[PDB]
Amino acid sequence: LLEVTVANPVEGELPITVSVDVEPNFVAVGLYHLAVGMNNRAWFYVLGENAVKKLKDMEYLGTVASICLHSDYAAALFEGKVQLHLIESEILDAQEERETRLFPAVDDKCRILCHALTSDFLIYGTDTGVVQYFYIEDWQFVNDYRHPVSVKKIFPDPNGTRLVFIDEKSDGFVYCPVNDATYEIPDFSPTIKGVLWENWPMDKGVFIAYDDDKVYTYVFHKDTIQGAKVILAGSTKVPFAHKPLLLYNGELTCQTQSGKVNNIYLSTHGFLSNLKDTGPDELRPMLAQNLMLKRFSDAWEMCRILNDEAAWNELARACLHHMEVEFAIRVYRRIGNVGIVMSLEQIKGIEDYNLLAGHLAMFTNDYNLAQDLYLASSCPIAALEMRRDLQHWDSALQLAKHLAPDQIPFISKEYAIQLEFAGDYVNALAHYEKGITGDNKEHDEACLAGVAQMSIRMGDIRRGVNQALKHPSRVLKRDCGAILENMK
């Protein structure tokens, strides 16, 4: 009733029990502080290593719905308004304008439904659907996003930039202020009570959404060939009355009803156990899970355990899909695929996002997506090149009207050549006569010879022999004699 246990098992800090004055209604813990409170009062304690000492018992105008702590700042949400202030409010050459502020502004007729506090920002969502970032260091709003519907809950990631918010319709979105976009979370359960971001330093995209029944593991694919998106990775049933507190490297420190924490191993992250005793039929789903979570190092380790070339190809395709050129180079080099290794090392130093996306899409044999990415890049003509390299002369002609019109004749002639070799002479004649230039004499002569042959095979024998006479090349006469023998 009167105890709060604060511990950092990951860093090895021993649990510290603090006896507070009153039975708290809300409990929050920051880097250097622990704020426990009820009604309109909140007691702040400094979490010293040896022991703690309460600084103040601050008063708030309304009923303190919630509070958030980080660094030396505390933001208390009460009565639809967030008061952001310092905790060790030392009056020592400290400006008054940054010591305390109230959100929203006095003119704004909106209520704050959810607020959060990262190492740099005061993030809050309003009943009008407004998500606003407030850079504490410079005391200025940096982001204003207008969601159509009010944002009921916000959960920033440990990096402090990317957010996950749930609105009235129980629709979870992942918000990225950097490119300033929202990606809807697939399969978001309507009754999800909370969201916990992954705290392991090398699992940036991973997060979980928990309700009273299951814990769903989602992953945000910030950089992929097919654009950013959220992908549901798995689900894990949890026992009765287990509200998760912490998520570290796939282990969930969840709070029970006895005031004792417990550790639950996620089904998606169930590979933390031993891998030698596990059979390949059990590793394959494990490998799929590791690939989905972008855990490429563990995927490599488990592929090495499998020693199955199909698994290595699966890992490498996953690496290419996630714009990881270096690791894909590693996997292909281990497999032995020389040509694709060299092709990747050709594009190893590419920086344009869309150009590299198109390259890695073409490497995976998705030419429509590769073209779509190439056109959006800074080197659009590359698309034409691959369409020219794929003998897609119709598509090459379609593109060359915009990118490279000087290649319009040559490509057209090549098209007709294919049409000639496919027996579709009618279009071959049209593209031959459409492939004529005014500078390349040899190209013009070849196109004229093609027009002559086609016109001869059109039954337009007079015109065909007419162009036959006016071409300085005995080989055209040689083949045209055979063609006339074909028409006898």
Next chain:
Amino acid sequence: QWLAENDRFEEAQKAFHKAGRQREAVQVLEQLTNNAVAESRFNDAAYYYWMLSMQCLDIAQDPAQKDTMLGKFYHFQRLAELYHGYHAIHRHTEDPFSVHRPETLFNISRFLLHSLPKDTPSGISKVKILFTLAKQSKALGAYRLARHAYDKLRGLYIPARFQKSIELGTLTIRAKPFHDSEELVPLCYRCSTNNPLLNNLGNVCINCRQPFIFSASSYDVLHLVEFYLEEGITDEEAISLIDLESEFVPVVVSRLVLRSMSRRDVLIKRWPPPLRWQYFRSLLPDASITMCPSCFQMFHSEDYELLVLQHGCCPYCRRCK
């Protein structure tokens, strides 16, 4: 060939040029450049590219291949400048410490950003250039060039070791006063105006289109305006006269004004015979710009002295003092 078999490959190039050879020397020096760029020795790559430019200029004395290879000389000179500039940016983003001043890094990053072509040369990653430009513009007080740097960075693929810093700076830069400090604004010297820290035309002015003249040690607009000669003035005549007492329009000086000019404020840049000498007038004769007699690169006099004393050679072309 003996040195090549003994792995003295830079000495092998020195020998191949010392003796008569223009086929094995060029290919071995190209291989040296490729080895340097493949590694992270970007200053060595710049030096090798500079010697490539010098060799191309020298053996362009042949009228047979003058036109087709003075272009190679210009291309390799520009690559030498780019790689010598980018070596500092590469060192800054890898060493835990900083060797150069923040002003120098800001200037170098800006110069690379403006002069780097659409197809960036090999090895030069412009994510590092833009990240350095954003950081240095934020530090020095150009809170509008930082915004541009972050906007450009949003359109490039970011290595996993830069994502946090860049995607947090792109956010925290919107809190800045949105203003460029006047102490960093470039100043054209023919028409004494103030150019934006970002120029769409490149390293060129706005009102006029006089190209900028950058110091080769810590990049900085030198108070030098390039002026040309009249069609009918010879270089020896030019020096003799001097010794006495949109739609870029060059400042073509006349014979009388050359008679009025003095040798104390003109930098002649005596290129070999295949190229006419480039004359630069210093609009601030009180200050002094020094030239390396080889590579003709221009440095601030005190900075040139300090760098030669520290190195024992020109920072650009390692010629012994």
Next chain:
Amino acid sequence: KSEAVWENMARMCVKTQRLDVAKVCLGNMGHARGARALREAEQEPELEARVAVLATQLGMLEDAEQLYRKCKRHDLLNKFYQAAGRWQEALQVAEHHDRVHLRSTYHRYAGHLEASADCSRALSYYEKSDTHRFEVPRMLSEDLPSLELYVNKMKDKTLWRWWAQYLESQGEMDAALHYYELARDHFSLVRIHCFQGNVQKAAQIANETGNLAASYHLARQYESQEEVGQAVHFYTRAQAFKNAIRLCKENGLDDQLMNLALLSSP
């Protein structure tokens, strides 16, 4: 329109050393990467190398290896071996025939080992090239005890300089002076001695060692300490005649100005 048929006859084209009909083949099987590789290889002034490249895109790595060997392009075969990940035949090709990409091959193999968490072999193959001074400090980042052990072991007079720079930008002035003194970087010794305020031992170091940069910086500190005569003398010692003559002009030491101007630059 069967892809297997096109693949088979492309392999046949490999067997027959003809690529003009092959170039139109691996654009009909949907192998855009291979067509791009052929386009890139077209710049080579050879025909065996191009067919080897096409084979590499078609697999059949033994045929491409033999064709590279027949072509005598040992650099291309070295790159082929590196791409295949053999990393041992590439080393022998470099040590026997390339002899110019040998250091580049060592660097690339060491980078491959580093990516494979083989730190010790990466150290060794960085040592085999001259790049270890550049790479090991980067490669041992976040491993400062190991990095200082390596710095003390190698004694390269530049690993000491790098470590001293780190210690200087780590609040370790005493250790920074120790490592700079080991590295004989007298400029850093003089700079930190003047910055810390002990100018006398900096002047003694400049006088004894004769480092031009150290003397220049020390005389600049003098000129910033309102002392001119010593500043002029230690500009003279550092051969910084321009600063010396400027100071003489400022303080009107015409007699001192003459001796500096006579031997100065034109």
